[PDB]
């Protein structure tokens, strides 16, 4: 239930070990006052420092003036930090505001349209995002609820997503979690200890073209519905052939152990792993950081479930875009549908107690 | 680690409250009584496996390559996680299989309550399965696999994910808070309270329905919270709504959470004053609910609330009087009941040969 340090060269919640739970919110900005938006960023940063240490925001959750609404809504009283991280990103639509147009990063690329997509516009996009991850869902929900509340009048929640369980790993020494298709997801990712690979594939560098984003990263989010009925009547072999790994151990086809290296020519040519692997994509590599979701039933007698896919990369054009384009013939396509999308530029870290989210962008 | 599946009573009622919930209501599609009994047996066999952390059937892998796996595999590598699976039978079930005359009188339909705004699509159901565990993926895997075993005979009508505390980092003794920020569960019925369970929770044979002896009756209410309105209320306003203070959760005028309330010190329409047994002719409930958050609604606001569950020996003498007494509750400003269902939760699976519903079906 320990704390993850909030300050750094980088924002936490990226290279950080992946926590069990997610509460992801996309916000739209409803103020045209740049000073008022800067004030909100600083208030949010102050709140995030309290939240990530397990403390109540502002003057607390009780013991103020009886006639005042409490500054903190109280539902995380008595809980631990629970490895809460709070990661902010700026969507491309933000840059149309506050005189920011010339500061939109080129690496913050709008995605192309992909075959098969049915994107819900209402649950897509956003001027900004906050990714809350924690081992306790109440802790994550408290954090989002309180940031939204602080932002009342200046931002609104466009759309949100709860992730009930992780489907990703930045810690290859630890058990790889399974997605709702029953396969381990995150075996060949990027570990938080692999500083060279993080610098190569995840962190923006000044020389890339956008100084304010040095030490930041770029995020793609995709809400991916799973066709659970269709998958569950597939044979074991068909399932394994879809991925290129066996189900129980998660080893590449033909191999004994999960972490043995793929031999891609032994996989079907439309196997997900074969198509996704960096060696199939000119070296393109991602830090995947997604979670499973369920959002009731579909009105047709079935559970509604999926995977909320999150990828961090140094440049959207060299990371998600080439990989996803290469999945055009993926065997997995028969079992999924992308139904939500958004991109964000995730700024560098909050250096110390005097810094604030977005300071390098806004000055 | 694991909670025994077998007993005089189903687990998941009196047994310790786990951190997470996946509750599903099912509608029955078969008209064939024998086919439904066969499903109850297959479900019981699966539940035995699930509650011990094992995959259903022949497993999640290693079978014949050309066969779909019996278990969908998303709980491989996880723990039993104190999973309990509790089945219940809705009033609508009894219109099937010739059962009309074995519907319990204690399984009463709820009246319309003031301020109800019930979504019929997220209300009712022929059956329910309450999956409670500390790991939400364990719960969801159970429901998903039961639904898959059932497909052809039952469908999922509605489902609800929920959460309480996270017990790895939160003391078990500690009362959880709801999303209004108040402690919720201080004055309840405990699993240790064997006599209170017999008085207020378990159906007795003498009550009129022999098949239900050792069972209980369940009321589910999906209760939306008006978070943004609540969060604009003053601290005094919030405490006045409940009759307890927010930080300690002590009754007004008292020092400690567990100090017994003086009801007359609370406002007349305070929640605790209206809900207390002394205000309801002694009517007492076993509350077993969970918070939810589904998302954002369409207007920027938080789709959050309380999935309220109450167990009782008779709906007519438990939930109905208490909820009736909340007609004037100060809390009503901040909540709305948007879903509802009732179930008759049969007695326990006695041993390895028994099956869910055996006392009803014979
Ligand atoms: C519901 C959707 C998806 C499911 C169920 C899924 C499942 C999996 C599984 C089971 C693995 C193998 C274990 C591992 O992580 O190494 C894997 C690998 C991977 N996936 Fe996905 N995936 C999905 C979507 C995507 C998307 C949208 C992308 C990128 C656009 C992606 C990129 C990758 C990458 C890069 C690998 C590692 C390949 C390698 O280097 O060995 N996945 N996926
Ligand atoms: C969102 C809806 C609700 C919230 C936020 C809420 C909150 C609470 C809180 C904070 C308490 C005090 C602590 C405790 O003893 O548990 C309480 C007590 C109680 N509530 Fe509620 N509750 C809600 C709905 C209901 C409903 C629908 C009923 C029953 C029909 C109910 C029955 C009770 C009872 C019987 C008590 C204990 C009273 C006593 O014996 O002292 N509640 N509730």
Residue numbers in the entry:
A (entry chain A): 55 to 417
B (entry chain B): 56 to 417
Provide text from the study.
Dye-decolourising peroxidases (DyPs) are a distinct structural family of peroxidases possessing an α + β dimeric fold that houses a b-type heme coordinated on its proximal side by a His residue. The soil dwelling bacterium, Streptomyces lividans possesses three DyPs; two belonging to the A-type and a third belonging to the B-type sub-families. The two A-type homologs, named DtpA and DtpAa react in their ferric heme state with H2O2 to form a two-electron oxidised derivative that is an Fe(iv)O heme carrying a porphyrin π-cation radical (Fe(iv)O[Por˙+]) – termed compound I.34–36 In the presence of a substrate, reduction of the porphyrin π-cation radical results in the formation of compound II (Fe(iv)O), with a second substrate molecule reducing compound II to the ferric state. By using an A-type member of the DyP family (DtpAa) as an exemplar, we combine protein engineering, X-ray crystallography, hole-hopping calculations, EPR spectroscopy and kinetic modelling to provide compelling new insights into the control of radical migration pathways following reaction of the heme with hydrogen peroxide.
The triple variant, Y345F/F347Y/Y389F, now mimics the Tyr arrangement on the distal heme side and the proximal Trp environment of DtpA. The X-ray crystal structure of the triple variant was determined to 1.50 Å resolution, confirming the presence of the introduced proximal Phe, and further corroborated the integrity of the structural H2O in proximity of Tyr347 and Asp358. Finally, disrupting the charge distribution of the Trp285/Tyr389 dyad in the triple variant, results in only two calculated routes, one to the proximal Trp and the second to the engineered distal Tyr347. By contrast to this low intensity free radical signal in the double variant, the triple variant (mimics DtpA on both distal and proximal heme) gave a strong EPR signal in the g = 2 region (compared to the double variant) with a line shape and microwave power saturation behaviour consistent with being caused by an uncoupled (not coupled to heme iron) protein radical. Spectral simulation of the radical signal was successfully achieved using TRSSA-Y.v2,35 unambiguously confirming it to be caused by a YO˙ species. Therefore, based on the near identical line shapes of the YO˙ species in the triple variant of DtpAa, and WT DtpA,35 we assign the YO˙ species in the triple variant to the engineered Tyr347 – the position homologous to 374 in DtpA. However, in the triple variant in which charge distribution over the ETA components of the dyad (Trp285/Tyr389) is disrupted by replacing the Tyr with a Phe, SigB is lowly populated and the YO˙ species (Tyr347) is almost fully populated.
